[PDB]
Design an enzyme around this catalytic site. Sequence first.
Site, PDB file in Angstrom:
ATOM      1  N   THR A   1      -6.871 -43.077  26.945  1.00 10.07           N
ATOM      2  CA  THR A   1      -6.377 -43.788  28.116  1.00 10.07           C
ATOM      3  C   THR A   1      -5.409 -42.916  28.897  1.00 10.07           C
ATOM      4  O   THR A   1      -5.499 -42.813  30.125  1.00 10.07           O
ATOM      5  CB  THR A   1      -5.689 -45.074  27.681  1.00 10.07           C
ATOM      6  OG1 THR A   1      -4.532 -44.749  26.901  1.00 10.07           O
ATOM      7  CG2 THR A   1      -6.624 -45.874  26.817  1.00 10.07           C
ATOM      8  N   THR A   2      -4.478 -42.281  28.186  1.00 11.99           N
ATOM      9  CA  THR A   2      -3.624 -41.270  28.792  1.00 11.99           C
ATOM     10  C   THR A   2      -4.454 -40.136  29.382  1.00 11.99           C
ATOM     11  O   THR A   2      -4.088 -39.553  30.407  1.00 11.99           O
ATOM     12  CB  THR A   2      -2.653 -40.733  27.743  1.00 11.99           C
ATOM     13  OG1 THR A   2      -3.391 -40.125  26.677  1.00 11.99           O
ATOM     14  CG2 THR A   2      -1.822 -41.873  27.167  1.00 11.99           C
TER      15      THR A   2
ATOM     16  N   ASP B   1      -5.032 -45.500  15.478  1.00 12.40           N
ATOM     17  CA  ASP B   1      -5.385 -44.118  15.776  1.00 12.40           C
ATOM     18  C   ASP B   1      -6.071 -43.467  14.586  1.00 12.40           C
ATOM     19  O   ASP B   1      -6.923 -42.589  14.764  1.00 12.40           O
ATOM     20  CB  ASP B   1      -4.138 -43.322  16.167  1.00 12.40           C
ATOM     21  CG  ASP B   1      -3.549 -43.774  17.489  1.00 12.40           C
ATOM     22  OD1 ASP B   1      -4.253 -44.478  18.243  1.00 12.40           O
ATOM     23  OD2 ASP B   1      -2.379 -43.437  17.772  1.00 12.40           O
TER      24      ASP B   1
END
Lengths: 509, 513, 513
Positions: free
Chosen positions: C83-84, C381
């Site tokens: 997303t980053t 993650d």
Amino acid sequence: AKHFSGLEEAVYRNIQACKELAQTTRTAYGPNGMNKMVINHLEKLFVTNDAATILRELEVQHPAAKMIVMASHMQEQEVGDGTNFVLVFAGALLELAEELLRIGLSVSEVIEGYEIACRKAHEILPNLVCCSAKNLRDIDEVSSLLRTSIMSKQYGNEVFLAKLIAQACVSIFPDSGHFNVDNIRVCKILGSGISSSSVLHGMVFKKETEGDVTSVKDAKIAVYSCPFDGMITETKGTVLIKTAEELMNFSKGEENLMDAQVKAIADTGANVVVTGGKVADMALHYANKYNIMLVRLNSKWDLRRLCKTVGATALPRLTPPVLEEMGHCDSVYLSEVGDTQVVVFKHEKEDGAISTIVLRGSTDNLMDDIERAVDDGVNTFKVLTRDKRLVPGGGATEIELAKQITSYGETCPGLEQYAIKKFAEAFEAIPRALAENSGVKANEVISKLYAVHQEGNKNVGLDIEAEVPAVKDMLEAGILDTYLGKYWAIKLATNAAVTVLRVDQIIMA
Amino acid sequence: AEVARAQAALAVNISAARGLQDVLRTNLGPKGTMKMLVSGAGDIKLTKDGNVLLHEMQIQHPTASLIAKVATAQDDITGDGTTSNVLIIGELLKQADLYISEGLHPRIITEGFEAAKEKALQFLEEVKVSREMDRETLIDVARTSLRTKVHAELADVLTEAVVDSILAIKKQDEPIDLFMIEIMEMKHKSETDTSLIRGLVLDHGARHPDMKKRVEDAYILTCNVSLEYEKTEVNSGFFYKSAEEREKLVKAERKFIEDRVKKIIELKRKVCGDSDKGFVVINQKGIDPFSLDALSKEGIVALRRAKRRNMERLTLACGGVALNSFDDLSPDCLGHAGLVYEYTLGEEKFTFIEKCNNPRSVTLLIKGPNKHTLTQIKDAVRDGLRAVKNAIDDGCVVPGAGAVEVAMAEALIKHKPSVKGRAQLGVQAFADALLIIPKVLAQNSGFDLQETLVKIQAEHSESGQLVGVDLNTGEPMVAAEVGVWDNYCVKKQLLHSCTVIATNILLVDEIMR
Amino acid sequence: NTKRESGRKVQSGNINAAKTIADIIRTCLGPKSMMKMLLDPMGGIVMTNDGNAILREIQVQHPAAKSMIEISRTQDEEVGDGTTSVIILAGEMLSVAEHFLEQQMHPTVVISAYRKALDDMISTLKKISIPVDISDSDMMLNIINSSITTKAISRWSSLACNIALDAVKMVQFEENGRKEIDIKKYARVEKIPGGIIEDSCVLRGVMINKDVTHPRMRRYIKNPRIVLLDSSLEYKKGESQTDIEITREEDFTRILQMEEEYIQQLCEDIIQLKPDVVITEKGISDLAQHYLMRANITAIRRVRKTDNNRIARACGARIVSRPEELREDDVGTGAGLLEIKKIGDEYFTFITDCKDPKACTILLRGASKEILSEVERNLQDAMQVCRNVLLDPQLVPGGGASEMAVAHALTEKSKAMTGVEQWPYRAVAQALEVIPRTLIQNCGASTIRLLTSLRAKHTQENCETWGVNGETGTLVDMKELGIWEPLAVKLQTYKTAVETAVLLLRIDDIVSG
């Protein structure tokens, strides 16, 4: 408070406050105060020759002044004179630190110089005392002592009120082994002459004196803020306004409805019955026929001073009086304290701590000025109790203060030297304060206080002789303070002032 | 919406950071001046305490949120150092700003601050030596750490009464001080004083002759719900409304007054006997004359108007516990203070509960009405005790006067970690930001913050000498030997809280609104 | 109404809001990281590693400020990473290619370009994707500790390496497909307030906070039986619907208790029949549930059939209408492990379940309340690689270098591709190389010449395997260095980025409606 900036407070606010606080000490202190019209949130002209009184009536917006004003009031607590004398030495010296800040000396430095110097000045003052006087049962000596205390803060009758307070401040304690916070409780009634102001003892209700004397010797009170109208907590004392058919019952019943009133009062015992509320028609008829004394329509100050002297509780709910609704006095003798027909109680040995000085005149400004006096004589009489000590009055002693702190400043080297160089002069603001109301020359009077070195003698007061500077002996002027009264002021002219510069700016959004 | 990126945003960051903080540097040692924060209510205040004037009211910044956060960590955890703490947080920005001025990345400057914070925190243990829990050794560290909050005098009168309290502990490893902070004051005509008083002392009590004045076995029934109520731990309502409702409670009050003294006398009959052992009902409301006699005349001590603050310092000190009622508290649950003694001086009636089984409490009785007297000492009491408590709980305390700051940046001297600039840039800005503590005192006083320091530095570069700027005249002196030692609990919390926030600002680039 | 907006200007509107988001979180991305400050109109500090978090908390523009949240939320749903990366690729590439190409006049060959610069990207990625073994939590480590440090966490990474790496292997879709790649249902992230790393146990199954909440609820029957209604309870939690009128005050209360009494009479039947477990999916309120604690039963309430029926297969329970009714075991024991590790008295049931449909709740404990969400994101993650490694043993070492491996090889294929095609191809291939050189920025030195040599190194020596790292900014073997770029990540982060590209390249108007 407000959001500020620029570290303005120190270089600006701190110097602003005291001089703004000043002129109340400067053109008012010593032999005479100069009047200041004061209109409080209730509008009337108010005379303040005292700094505290005008400081009382000055609402302090300054963060700086809010510190010093209170400690300038605390001398009316601790002395009663020299409450002016707080600010004159306070900010003058304080002003002298800004040029020391111009010298570059740090804020905490020059303040410490003031502490060690006032502690030094605290050493100087008692040496500067000339003999002492105390007689706590006597008018003459006390009046000569208290007169400077009123003179500074009074432009009016001096010896006369000095005598009347030296009457009162004494006479409430017929002999003073000591003197309380406040004993003399004035019944404030204007009119007649301003010298028609007199001194009696006990509590006076200048509201309705009613019922009738039931016992002139026993003054025993049932004190109520409560209406005697038939209002009472045992039954329903409702006045009936509903119809003429209704009200006649109250006409028939209030004789009986005041009967459950006076007797629930007087059967548990009473003689005077102090009414902060009212008493109805047939109630008063019944109370006049039962001949119970009801002092009526009384103020709190009426109800309170009584509850302050005998001890008592004036309550809006009527009920059998407890001995904390039941006080006893010396006597209740209907008489005039200063030319007004009112109920006047008497308290010295019974309870005491109440002495009526009726404060008279044309206007309450003539009351307020003579109210300053007697009060300025109250506090300093307790000062007269704590020490027999008499310093020569304001402005004569100040050089021995200044002279040594000068030489002390000469022994100062180390940077606070200049700061104690500042500390030395700030006592010479006292001849200056008494010079500038006089309109005469500070530094020359200061010089007239130097070269001759009369050191507790030479001073220019505030006189009709003040057209030209003439240094007069304060020790003989009838103006005599005391090292304590000094030390209290010399402490409290410093503490709040020496701590007010140590502040930095207010930090807000 | 609007986009303020990096240098445009980080400026407002760094501008708001050091905007208040640089003026906050008016406080350190005794010589740092006092700042007056007047909150919107109008309270005139003086704290050389660094954090205090922040959290109440201040110039509103984005960083105002962070400066209130990190200024907390020093006095909250340790109890001292915010006067010396808040100043370093952007002191480390001043040098880095000049390094960022090279186009040196906010992140390469970010990683640098964390680097040598190790070395100096490592050096804090390195520089400190174990210093005693002794009165004067405390007093020494007191005379330092007290002044590392506020000015000398009040710290100097808190250099004794404080050292006793943190010493008077039953035993406490708490880095701060709780129950031995008991705030009392008798408004006093003379300027100021703080009266150190051991054990819990009641703000008010009722001492009547028929009670036990001096009570050697004092078994405390803590009492609140008055003689006006019956078997309840909370008071009920009143009737003033109706005349017949006015006659209901005062007549039946006889039921309520005796019902309580019933328990009270018999609980003395039970526990204390009668004339043999003293019983104590501590009545935290008023005491009605029937039982105020009957509590007395039975021999029970009836202590009027004790604060809950007393009540909590009552329990742990006496070893017993409290109650909300005038009725029976268990003999165990009864508070036992081997002396329940009410001393009255001036304005207030002070009941000593003493021979405390485990006193956790002492009392500080302040003097004087004026807030210019009180706010100076009041604000230093909290920071007076907890600070010296950091000297007693930790025999390890770091020498003050920045002699530790000068003794690192000389060892930290640039490129001892020679690898690159960016980490060095931190340890460089960090070595330079270390030196504020000598600087700020020589900033307060004369020479220069440099001229003294560069002498101090040299004087420290002269071997065998830990030297620092004088806490008053801004001149050379030896921090160890003079006896100025910062709390190591201050000193570790000094470097952590300072370096993290600036680093937290260093990853900050774009601000949006 | 009647309004017309045009093309490249709307494309620019698509460029604008995205181009802002492409910057800070790109700096926040990778081993060279930042924070995005958010000024509240009142001044409140906000900084995150996610700009969409900053966007949600501030003004969001109808252009890609809205979409770069959306497609990153699309990126947030799938692999839970990038997303980053998506925000910073899309608006960048849309800022890069369009102007150069639209001055040549075409979205058209740019339409083909993104999937062509995707083609080799996806192509040589998988080709240089290095196999990393599934069987080893250590050979799953260097990739998963790389993935959890893509958001810069090594903190709970190794612990997420412990729990989750075998947990996705224990994640089974009951379609009996993958399994290996797992959407989050059969694998969930759910946490326990507080705790400690040992109060964190590797938990590969469902975790019901409601299985054992209380001690009077079931205690360690290692294969419970979850009863859903139907006999032991029934299908009515009802209301008798009593007639009502103003004259009956008792009549208001009877209808209120009637909801509970049927909930009670079912639980009363449970009191009668007494299972070890009942699952009440209609739910039981506090009243009747307090009655199940005296019957030696847990009350599992207001969970779902899907979870329960999986819990049944997960914890060894099954749906049977009565405890006295015994039909057969679909799972005799379905548990890998049964645990309850309590924080406080409130109980939390940890049932470790291997290759069950279950929830695969992976127990994630911060040292305390706050960093639990860290361990959640880390174990989330984690499972990203855990489902990537188990699917794809191949994953590219890189993300500084993989970003280079993509970029330099892309235009390197224009050497093969050429045509008019090459021009939008490279232009959509241009922006990619900058991502490490954007991080090599905060490496200091020269962010350009490094990658330049690395770009040479790309086709010279190796590309993503041997290449640039955000930690280094210079050539290291990302395998030897242990920095890994999951294969599933790059297939997505660019895609959704180039998905929003052609779209916002093709959306040429915004009507008033």
